[PDB]
């Protein structure tokens, strides 16, 4: 049974970056050339691994981390980067091993009058740990006074909506991003390229 990569890439709807959905791939022969053959996946940045050699290595599990972000914030998705998404939504470790695959999705994700179904976290006490998810929608405290978990001055909802519109610039159009996160821990692997 072949692996579901193309199901992840062509999923009809992607998850919000703050609640970044994770799909786990295991016990399958993962052909990476075929996804690399789909050049319309414009961004193919890879770190801590050789993208070509993925077809030769084995891994215990591969996580298909899928979400949507603005085009300009795509730069924040990389090792050692900082900013809105890299801190409060999806922090990649500075020693990250894997690949990020991002492509413009304005043709489908963007809607007239904005697409607000995609949301991102921007307020938090500290940086997210690598691969940390935080769905907590509680009112974030930004001052001395506790504000009873109800929105008001100096205490805000930590999530904001992108509102993607079709006509925005390339740097601000939605970019569907799927991030391959790898695993190998003291046991025989399950996923192998060859």
């Amino acid at each position: 049974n072949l692996c579901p990569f193309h199901e992840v890439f062509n999923a009809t709807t992607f998850a919000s970056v703050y609640a970044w959905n994770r799909k786990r791939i295991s016990n399958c022969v993962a052909d990476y050339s075929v996804i690399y053959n789909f050049a319309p996946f414009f961004a193919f940045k890879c770190y801590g691994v050789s993208p070509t050699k993925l077809n030769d290595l084995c891994f215990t599990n591969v996580y298909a981390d899928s979400f949507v972000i603005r085009g300009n914030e795509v730069s924040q998705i990389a090792p050692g980067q900082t900013g809105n998404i890299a801190d409060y939504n999806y922090k990649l470790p500075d020693d990250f091993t894997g690949c990020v695959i991002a492509w413009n999705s304005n043709k489908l994700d963007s809607k007239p009058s904005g697409n607000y179904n995609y949301l991102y976290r921007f307020l938090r006490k500290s940086k997210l740990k690598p691969f940390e998810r935080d769905i907590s929608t509680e009112i974030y405290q930004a001052g001395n006074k506790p504000c009873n978990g109800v929105a008001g001055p100096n205490c805000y909802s930590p999530l904001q909506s992108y509102g993607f519109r079709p006509t925005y610039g390339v740097g601000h159009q939605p970019y569907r991003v799927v991030v391959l996160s790898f695993e190998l821990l003291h046991a025989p692997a399950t996923v192998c390229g060859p």
Partner: antibody
Amino acid sequence: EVQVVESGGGLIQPGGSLRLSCTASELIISRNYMSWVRQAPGKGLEWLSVIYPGGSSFYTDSLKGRFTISVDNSKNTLYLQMNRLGVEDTAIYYCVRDAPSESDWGQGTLVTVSS
Amino acid sequence: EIVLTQSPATLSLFPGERATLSCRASQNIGHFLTWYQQKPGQAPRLLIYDASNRATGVPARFSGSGSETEFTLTISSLGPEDFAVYYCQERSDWPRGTFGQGTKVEIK
């Protein structure tokens, strides 16, 4: 209005260094987006630097390598270390908290780089 | 680098007149643009965020419009306090961004 007060601005010789200070009464500086913006006399505003709640900070290319931004969690202050100040740096430097629905500026402190 | 050309340099309206302030961007930045009010000798004050949304405490007379490369601040009626400088700042990397040269609201 939430009040933030700047301090530490004054006369300085060319080529010197300076540290501006900014304090917050109501809000917590460590838990907010804080930026420094200067307004040279009779000239437009120029955003200098920002520090995020998580400690991430950014600078303009015109100021990279000269200005540095830092915070104090216990005292609840924001600091801007300035190095190699020229005459053109003469400006009122503001401390501002930026939020999607709010922007709380202080009242600025003058920096005079002159002989 | 994104450069914003505010116009007119000076907007000499009589009090109570509607004030329209143009701010044009050299790049398509979407609606990520912010407008700041600034009384003389005082720190700026946020009016509009994302070019359309009025900030808290700002009177309803203020309103924003335009997108992408042509943005316009609209004051339905200039009050005496409204006679001040106004800056447009892009927010492509919020809260970062460059400012416009500003527009002065004074008649004589």
